[PDB]
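Researcher: Sequence of ribonuclease A follows. Predict its structure.
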Amino acid sequence: KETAAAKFERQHMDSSTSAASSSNYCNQMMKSRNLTKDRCKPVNTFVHESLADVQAVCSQKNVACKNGQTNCYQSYSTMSITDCRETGSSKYPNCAYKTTQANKHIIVACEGNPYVPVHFNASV
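Model: Prediction complete. Tokens:
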């Protein structure tokens, strides 16, 4: 089965672009990354940085995850991200999203050996 690490890359990484370039970014990326295959995932965040810089977060500032777990880490620096939120007109299978660009610090949960990100927790 797809690993947790691989899933994190598929759902959250976009090292191919520096930022979302148009209002259709989320619509296209949510579909292409197969995140709307079974249902319309409500929210999703894409990270426009190298995978190595994101993996390195696992060795950055340790913080509690939103739920209280302590295997979370916050990036020392801000990162370019794109927030995707379902719109009022979204209707499975034609899922629809609003694209929002931002620059913030990311918080991920890490696991394994090598110790890598497996969950996107929040952006602050």
